[PDB]
Design a protein around this nucleic acid. Structure first.
Lengths: 118, 150, 104, 162, 196, 130, 51, 173
RNA sequence: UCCGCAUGAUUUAUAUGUAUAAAAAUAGAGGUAGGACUUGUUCCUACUCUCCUGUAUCGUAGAAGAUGGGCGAUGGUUGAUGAAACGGAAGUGUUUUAUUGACUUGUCCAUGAAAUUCCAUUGAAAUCUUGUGCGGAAUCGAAUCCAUUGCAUACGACUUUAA
RNA sequence: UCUAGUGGGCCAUUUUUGGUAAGCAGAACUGGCGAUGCGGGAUGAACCGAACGUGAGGUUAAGGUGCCGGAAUGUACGCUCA
């Protein structure tokens, strides 16, 4: 959780998704017989590869060195009593404001950081 | 673009990558093999300085089929202790003066991964050394090549 | 008050015929006509000074710093690495080579 | 967890021979950039320098050995100046850990008038009295020190001597 | 060594291509260049070769619309500018900016006749062309190709030279008086020890 | 006015011996000649005409002379002071001294030039006013 | 073990860990403390300058 | 850069020939390996020896006995053109016979476009007599009263000061 | 809408001295009061000054440059008014002249720069239009549409007329 | 052991056959493209160099160093005026 370095920050947009609206930005492997992107010609977009994989020690870590653990209730928040310095609670979006208040209070009492507090 | 015969010889000489160096004992068999692979390799007579610099900086031994740096005499003693080779110094002695266990001493050493020469090669690299290239026998000029390549 | 820096020009990035490397910049220093003279300026701090439109901290002047690394070519041109890569819109702009890490 | 103990022992800094005590140096950066000062002693990695206050106006302070250009001007005698007084703690800011603020109404108290107590100027007067004959005897030295340094057109630092 | 704001180059005795190459490199470096007396530029080879080369260049026009075809400028300054433009990457913004900083003119106009003019030794004909080998003049080539202002430029150059000679004589008088005063100064004896 | 012949004194402008005097004692060809100097640090050698510049001093010396007799003729004739007491060598020496000075010398030169400028300005003003 | 390779030709401590003789090794020893004659031969000189 | 080597070799002794003849020649080669290669190349023409069937018993670099005096060198060569084989004789004034050979190679390449591989140096001799010196331009350098102006060059650059892009005034000669 | 009693924004500022205006050839007069009279394709005059291009010349000390003095000149530098003249190739610039200023570092003196106590920052001042307080009044308009003509015209456009 | 795809090939060096020849057709060896990105030959499937995980630093191959364009308007000897 120290010196977190990302090899690549771009999201690997799909080819021609910027040109055609029916083509989503979610990555698809090009499989054309004359695909310049697949052949990796100079100046074309890069394809996702295993070499882009981030360090295992810093993988899944937020810039603060924590991992955003999703919590839906106070019982979920209590799961991070011992793992306070590695996991940070993220309140689920479908949780009501009344239960979110209790979740925030429990996280504050346990010292667990909240990624989306307030 | 390597012919099958030259490719097989270089595999048997453990020269499977560019800028790779090995020690061989010069006999009729090795001389004829080097003659066949003349366009693809250079070879010559190394001196004591070249041999010791190679084994001290690029010295890697093959223990358990692994490339391990010769950072301690214990590794050499474990690998070649049965041949009375207990240190990098007598490993250098066995390599320089071709002794009884030269085959074991040379096979234990991983092929040297030399860098590109400092100052580059000649104007055209893939001509013979006699013609002005960097191929074939070069006699003592292998020492200068290794010095640039180390 | 006068100047304590040598004038310099930002020529281009390190590049081949068609491939550019914006991580290093080519700098021509006034009065440096050989790679032997470039050895004196090796390691010297070099700054690009430009103006802006928003005052920041009361000053409208922004400076990008860097260090000369190695000579380039035979005519005294040097390679420099900056904290932020110099924008290529500054190709041909003025840079200041300081004497801050001096050894004379 | 406890980190490993590194094997980087601290060893004394060895400086250039040109930065001898009494040498005239040119300040390259800072408030007094371009000024000419006299080296009194040598600290760990810095030099204790001061152009005499009756000519220069630069007080007794430190300067990084890299941020000065030594000049081949005739050396100024600094034999008796009590160099041992100037240490790292001498040019050390007060203990400011905790209650410190940098708002207004603080620059009227940090001015040298209502600050910089005695034993600074009082010792500087005595040290200047000791050092005065050397500058007086050397011709052009007083005006040379008072004059700042600048690069004129056509000046090439890599070829000119200092 | 020369990082000045604006440089004025007297094009007389210079070779067109070598001067254009130096000027283009300076423009890309970020230096404003004003080239004067472009009609005195020289091109290696005898006049018939250069005349035929320009005629071949002039013959190249768009088949369906010469108005949008290649524009063949006849003035010597425009010939120099065409050489510089060919040496520059003018189709990019950087090349267009570099070309915008060049001001090539015929003769020495009043904006620049009172400014210092320099030369490029790497492009000088006397230093680059072997003696005895004939060369042409861009001004003569332009005049025989369609440039109309060869005679008026010559007349204005005669007037400018007369004015410049008068200015030089007035400056020479001041220089001789300063030298005479400096000769009798006793400071020179103690100053010569420093090489001055 | 200057030609390349045996006895011609030249100044070396290229190589390690730049700024040194020499005398041509033998002409190898139209591109090279053999030169020598009485100085111990300068060895007799063969140099190209592009690395040297001809001077005005021509001394009487036999073709293919040896180093010993070259030095003897150099001492016998006044070639040493002939070159030394010339505008060329004096101007070179002033250049050398001007390049062999430090910042303190530069300050002294500036002050001396300021004094000379003031005196000259007064002199020209008085002379012109008459 | 062996997280980073040190060059013995650069690191004296590693150059001492290996090769214990390095400390006692000597070089540049003079062996010309004698008349130091020449072995050329008239026959060899004539052959060298034969043509 | 060329050097002159004397190379002495012979055939490997056999049952019929226990004392083979020793053959020596002087060759101008960049290095000893090229010199020995040239030796075998020239020996294969006349004798029935090869590198496999022969051995080199000596190779010594020869330096100029008088490098500090001007000499005239006459070189007989045999070279192959694009049509046939020719024999030429050339004269060069130099202080070293190796330098004369290098000048000969440069001149042949410049004039006849002849490469190193197509030129055989038959003989190099030193001519100390103008009665045997036959080239008029070489002989004109032997007169006691020889004088001429400096060859027309690009004037003196003189140090780094000649690297300025611009000049304040026109040059003078 | 012009001058000033001034504030603010911008640049000269693509700045850090970013100062420098003869001509033409190179086996030559290169010219430097170049000298030499006799205004000429003249000398024995000046002759080794020409050639190291500018590595030159001019400027360059002072809290980004302050306060008070003695000697030395009898000048130099920077501005506003004044009398002007000369510059047309794009002259928008170059000289000279009187009043009014301030410094003068040519030399010697004194006081004062600090803690911004080891660098990360580029300074004072001058010119320009747009906002606000204006005293002083305003010496002063055109184009188009709508109409009209046919020397014009698919429509625009063009050539006329109009109060 | 089980099974997929394939069963139209093409280019270059060398050895060739049939044809006037072909960017023609048919054979042999090797290396390639097909399935090979990258540097160079201005441009390109085969030619040269070199076979590719994500990056930092250094050095090179082939190829280049007047400008476009990164790099000597480098050195030495000659030839050539179209």
């Amino acid at each position: 959780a120290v010196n977190i370095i990302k090899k690549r920050t771009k999201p690997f947009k799909r080819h021609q998704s910027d040109r055609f609206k029916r083509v989503g930005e979610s990555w698809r492997k090009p499989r054309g017989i004359d695909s310049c992107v697949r052949r990796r010609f100079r100046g074309t977009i890069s394809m996702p590869k295993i070499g882009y994989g981030n360090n295992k020690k810093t993988r899944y870590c937020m810039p603060n060195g924590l991992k955003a653990f999703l919590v839906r209730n106070v019982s979920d928040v209590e799961l991070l009593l011992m793992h306070n310095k590695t996991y940070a609670a993220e309140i689920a979006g479908n949780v009501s404001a009344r239960k979110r208040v209790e979740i925030v209070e429990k996280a504050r009492a346990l010292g667990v950081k909240v990624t989306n507090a307030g | 673009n390597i012919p099958p015969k030259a490719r097989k010889i270089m595999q048997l000489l453990r020269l499977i990558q560019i800028n790779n160096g090995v020690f061989v004992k010069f006999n009729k068999a090795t001389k004829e093999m080097l003659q066949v692979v003349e366009p693809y390799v250079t070879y010559g007579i190394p001196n004591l300085k070249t041999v010791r610099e190679l084994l001290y900086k690029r010295g890697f031994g093959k223990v358990n089929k692994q490339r391990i740096a010769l950072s301690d005499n214990a590794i050499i003693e474990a690998a070649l202790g049965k041949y009375s080779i207990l240190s990098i110094e007598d490993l250098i002695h066995e390599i320089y003066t071709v002794g009884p266990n030269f085959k074991q001493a040379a096979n234990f050493i991983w092929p040297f991964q030399l860098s590109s020469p400092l100052g580059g090669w000649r104007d055209r690299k893939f001509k013979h050394f006699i013609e002005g290239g960097d191929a074939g026998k070069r006699d003592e000029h292998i020492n200068s090549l290794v010095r640039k390549m180390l | 008050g006068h100047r304590l820096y040598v004038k310099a020009k930002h020529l281009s990035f390190q590049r081949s015929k068609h491939v550019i490397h914006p991580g290093t910049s080519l700098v021509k220093i006034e009065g440096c006509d050989s790679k032997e003279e470039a050895q004196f300026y090796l390691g010297k701090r070099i700054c690009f000074v430009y103006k802006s439109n928003k005052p920041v901290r009361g000053s409208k002047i922004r400076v990008i710093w860097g260090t000369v690394s190695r000579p380039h070519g035979n005519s005294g041109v040097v390679r420099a690495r900056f904290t932020h890569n110099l924008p290529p819109k500054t190709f041909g702009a003025s840079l200041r080579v300081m004497l801050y890490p001096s050894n004379v | 967890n406890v980190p490993k103990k590194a094997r980087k022992a601290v060893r004394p800094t060895k400086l250039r021979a040109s930065l001898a005590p009494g040498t005239v140096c040119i300040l390259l950066a800072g408030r007094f950039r371009g000024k000419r000062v006299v080296v009194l002693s040598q600290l760990e990695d810095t030099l204790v320098v001061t152009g005499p206050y009756k000519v220069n106006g630069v007080p007794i302070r430190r300067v990084n050995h890299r941020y000065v250009i030594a000049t081949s001007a005739p050396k100024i005698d600094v034999s008796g100046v009590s160099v041992e007084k100037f240490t790292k703690a001498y040019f050390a800011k007060q203990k400011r850990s905790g209650p410190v603020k940098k708002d207004e109404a603080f620059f009227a108290e940090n001015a040298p008038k209502n600050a910089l107590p005695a034993e600074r100027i009082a010792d500087q007067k005595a040290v200047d009295a000791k050092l005065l004959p050397a500058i007086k005897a050397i011709p052009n030295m007083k005006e040379y020190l008072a004059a700042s340094f600048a690069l004129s057109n056509g000046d090439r630092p890599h070829l000119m001597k200092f | 060594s020369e990082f000045q704001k604006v440089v004025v180059i007297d094009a007389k005795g210079h070779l067109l291509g070598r001067l254009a190459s130096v000027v283009a490199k300076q423009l890309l470096g970020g230096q404003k260049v004003v080239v004067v007396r472009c009609e005195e530029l020289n091109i290696s080879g005898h006049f018939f070769r250069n005349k035929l080369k320009y005629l071949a260049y002039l013959r190249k026009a768009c088949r369906y619309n010469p108005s949008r075809g290649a524009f063949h400028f006849r003035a010597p300054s425009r010939i120099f500018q065409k050489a510089v433009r060919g040496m520059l990457p003018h189709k990019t913004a950087r090349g267009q900016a570099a070309l915008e900083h060049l001001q090539a003119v015929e003769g020495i106009p009043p904006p620049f006749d009172k400014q210092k003019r320099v030369v490029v030794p790497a492009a000088l004909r006397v230093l680059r062309l072997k003696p005895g080998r004939k060369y042409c003049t861009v001004g003569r080539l332009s005049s025989e190709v369609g440039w109309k202002y060869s005679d008026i430029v010559s007349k204005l150059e005669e007037r400018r030279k007369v004015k410049s000679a008068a200015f030089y004589q007035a400056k020479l008088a001041k220089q001789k008086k300063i030298a005479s005063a400096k000769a009798a100064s006793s400071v020179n004896g103690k100053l010569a020890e420093f090489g001055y | 006015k200057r030609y390349v012949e045996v006895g011609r004194v030249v100044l070396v402008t290229k190589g390690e011996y730049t700024g040194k005097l020499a005398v041509i004692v033998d002409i190898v060809d139209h591109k090279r000649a053999l030169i020598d100097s009485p100085c111990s640090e300068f060895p007799r050698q063969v140099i190209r005409y592009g690395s040297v510049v001809l001077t005005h001093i021509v001394m009487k010396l036999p073709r293919g002379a040896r180093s010993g007799i070259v030095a003897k003729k150099w001492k016998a004739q006044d070639v040493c002071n002939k070159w030394a007491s010339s505008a060329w060598a004096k101007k070179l020496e002033a250049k050398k001294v001007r390049s062999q000075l430090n910042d303190f010398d530069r300050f002294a030169v500036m002050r001396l030039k300021k004094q000379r400028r003031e005196q000259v300005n007064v002199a020209v003003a008085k002379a012109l006013k008459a | 073990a062996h997280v980073q390779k040190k060059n013995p030709l650069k690191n004296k401590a590693v150059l001492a860990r290996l090769n214990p003789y390095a400390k006692a090794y000597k070089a540049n020893v003079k062996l010309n403390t004698g008349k130091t004659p020449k072995a050329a031969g008239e026959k060899f000189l004539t052959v060298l300058h034969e043509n | 850069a060329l050097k002159e080597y004397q190379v002495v070799g012979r055939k490997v002794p056999t049952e019929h020939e226990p004392v083979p003849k020793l053959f020596r020649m002087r060759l101008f080669a960049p290095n000893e390996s090229v010199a020995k290669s040239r030796y075998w190349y020239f020996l294969k023409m006349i004798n029935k020896v090869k590198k496999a069937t022969g051995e080199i018993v000596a190779i010594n670099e020869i330096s100029e006995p008088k490098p500090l005096k001007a000499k005239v060198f006459g070189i007989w060569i045999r070279y192959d053109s694009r049509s046939g084989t020719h024999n030429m004789y050339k004269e060069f004034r130099d202080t070293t016979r190796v330098g004369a050979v290098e000048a000969m190679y440069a001149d042949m390449a410049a004039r006849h476009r002849a490469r190193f591989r197509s030129i055989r140096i038959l003989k190099v001799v030193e001519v100390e007599k103008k009665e045997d010196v036959r080239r008029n331009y070489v002989k004109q350098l032997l007169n006691p009263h020889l004088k001429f102006p400096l060859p027309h060059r690009r004037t003196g650059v003189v140090g780094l000061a000649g690297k300025k892009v611009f000049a304040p005034h026109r040059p003078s000669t």
